[PDB]
Amino acid sequence: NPLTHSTPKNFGIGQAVQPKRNLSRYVKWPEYVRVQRQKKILSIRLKVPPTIAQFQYTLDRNTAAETFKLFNKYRPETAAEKKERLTKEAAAVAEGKSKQDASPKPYAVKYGLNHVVALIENKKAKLVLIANDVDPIELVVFLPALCKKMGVPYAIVKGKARLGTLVNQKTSAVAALTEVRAEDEAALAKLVSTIDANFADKYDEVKKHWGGGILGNKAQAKMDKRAKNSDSA
Amino acid sequence: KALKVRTSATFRLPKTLKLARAPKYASKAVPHYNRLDSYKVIEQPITSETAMKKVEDGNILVFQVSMKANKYQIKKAVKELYEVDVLKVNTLVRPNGTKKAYVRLTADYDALDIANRIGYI
Amino acid sequence: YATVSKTHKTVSRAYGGSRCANCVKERIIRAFLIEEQKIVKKVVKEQTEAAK
Amino acid sequence: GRVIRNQRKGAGSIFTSHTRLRQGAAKLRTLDYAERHGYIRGIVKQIVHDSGRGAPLAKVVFRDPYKYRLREEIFIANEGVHTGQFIYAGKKASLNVGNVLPLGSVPEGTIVSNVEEKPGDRGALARASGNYVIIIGHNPDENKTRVRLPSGAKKVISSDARGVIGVIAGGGRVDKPLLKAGRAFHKYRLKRNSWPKTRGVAMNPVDHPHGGGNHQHIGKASTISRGAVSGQKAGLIAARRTGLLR
Amino acid sequence: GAYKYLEELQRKKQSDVLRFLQRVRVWEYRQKNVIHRAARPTRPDKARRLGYKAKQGFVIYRVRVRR
RNA sequence: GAUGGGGAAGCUCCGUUUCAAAGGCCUGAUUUUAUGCAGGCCACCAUCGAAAGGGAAUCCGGUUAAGAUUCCGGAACCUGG
RNA sequence: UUGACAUUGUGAAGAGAUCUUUACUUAUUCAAUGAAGCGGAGCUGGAAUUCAUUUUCCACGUUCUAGCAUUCAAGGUCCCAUUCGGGGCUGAUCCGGGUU
């Protein structure tokens, strides 16, 4: 207390070598980082046509959680289950003379983007989820147009990873239900009614809009102070 | 949620584990036997009048030693073959393309005594 | 110099084997009388607050 | 024909600069926070002679802001500086000889040297000895500044462009007759291989456009079009007038 | 199948959507090296009718030649 | 003069720290065992290029048909451990 | 050295029955640095002169001197289980991560 002294260090330029601060904003990133950050900035600055930007309207977290808990019931067989039931029918079918229909009718989510697209065309899809993902965007951009054309409900949900876990893949890019059990028959239509509203019923009016055109916020702040302070002196 | 704190603007490779080799097969499968050994280091003595005049005087053995041998391998294979102890080794490459060695045994020995033990004197 | 005792390479002042002892005499004068007048400057910045 | 002597300087073999004794590239300090929001003080350690140049250099030693050390830089020394001088650098610095300020910070009629074309090029204009630019006016909106280049041209630059106050040392240099071919030999050994110059008149039709003939004479006009092409250009190039002034 | 739709979309290269993608992509590549590794085809059905399969040992590279 | 990159049908050219995720240290943390995990660091970032430039340290006497500041005898010195 | 087409997107003014200005930024181009202090809002005074109350910009730790400035920072405060010391907040305003 008597012996301890109070230094204070004076950062007033001109003196006191600066302290260590957080430079996280200023660092020079790798050139792969800096590409994928400006590949986002450049899709925001440009004017994105109406058939893009119909993505980025995506099912919000509430109906999202409600949506998967329906599909989560219907997940396809795993490898082991298939491995397991390939023993049963072997022992079941050959012995008891049965026709190898001995197993129940499976009800599972349909996946793959060549299969689902062919389901929609024969109108066998009761719902469809779509990932705002798929960097090769052209794969997925006509689906809202077929669904709305063929009178199939559809949705756009964030991520192909979550769409991938219920199919047991890494990534998926689509999902569908062509069949549903009577316990979930009523729980199905409560999702559709909320899903038809925000996607397939807004489809026509969304095709007017052009997204993007958002200025970065050092440009936005200089625009405003020119656009505001023109008027008010 | 929040981000890191970097006190310096430089981003360098994160140091990631390096993994030692675990070869499936081996390389040459037979380790090569000792290439330069006791007997291949010193092939012959040197019998010329000038050579033999040091042996019988200055207690110095004079050998024709292989080209690949250095003063460490020589001092070691004189001790091993001929049993002696060595003060000093001096070497020169003769201008026929071979190397001569002047090996000076310690005062505990007489090179003349060992010189005639292997059959030259 | 790697072979030599340290008394050959040094003198026993501060800044021994480096500055010429009249360059140490100054930078003591200059370190004392600059941070002397520098205290008188910081009271005037307390007075210039209350004086105005 | 042959390839002439001025076409032969481009490939730059024996024509490069003689760089050995040069103290370094004389520049101003990198433009940073401390200098554009305030000032930072160095002191000039020694003002010294640079080879190949006509003007002395000064070495001022700053203190690095973000790391403990000293950093010393090479300024072309303005006339009147002296070792032991404090040299202040930054927006809020003061108007005195040797202090480097932005040009917007100085009144019109101020004499500065080693001024920058664009902010942060570490100096361009008026670096030769005795030269200076004058600040003749400002343009506080869409910020510019009106300065008079040492030739007499009037250029308009940014107002964030720094420049150092005063005249560059080494004035009066060309007042002294050179007097002999030896002293011009010791001049260009430290610069480059330009010297001596054989008159293109005195060489053959291969060596030059002016060569040949049973008398020494050019034979066609010595003024050449700006739209001439490689190797045609020798003599007075694209001149608007010619001949002794009156 | 889904590849008869992608086929026709890439035959309209001045359509307002693809001339957006062409503009965002060409900026991507010009930052990358002149020859670099493509983790995945940009035209899955264009490569596929040329003999590409999706399996280990079919590799895609992206190459930029002066014009 | 490689590397990274950039041209070039190509042989190869540019450039030499350049639009680069370019590297291994000082020991504290261990007394299960040696080195995990630790804070801090330092950003100079190939190599080549001189028997006349820079540079760690050796002298006298004797000796051979022909070698010696090298061999002999004696008296020193430097460097790494 | 010029014109046209392509790179090449966003839209306003003014003349001519297409041109000249001029805006936007993200492409494209240039420049700097061991990609550190950008843009926006703030608090303190205060030039300011108040026609309701702030309308607005400037500010905002260093100038007799060839001294000195580095160890998560001393101080201040509070935690953890006191054990020697360690972890927080501030000292050093906050937000957007567009390196300028």
Short mmCIF file of C-alpha atoms (C1' of nucleotides) in Angstrom, two decimals, chain G residues 76-79 86-88:
data_model
loop_
_atom_site.label_atom_id
_atom_site.label_comp_id
_atom_site.label_asym_id
_atom_site.label_seq_id
_atom_site.Cartn_x
_atom_site.Cartn_y
_atom_site.Cartn_z
"C1'" G G 76 -9.28 0.90 -8.95
"C1'" U G 77 -13.08 -2.69 -8.17
"C1'" C G 78 -15.23 -7.69 -7.85
"C1'" C G 79 -14.98 -13.05 -8.04
"C1'" G G 86 -5.22 -17.35 -10.68
"C1'" G G 87 -9.83 -15.77 -13.44
"C1'" G G 88 -12.92 -11.07 -14.59
#
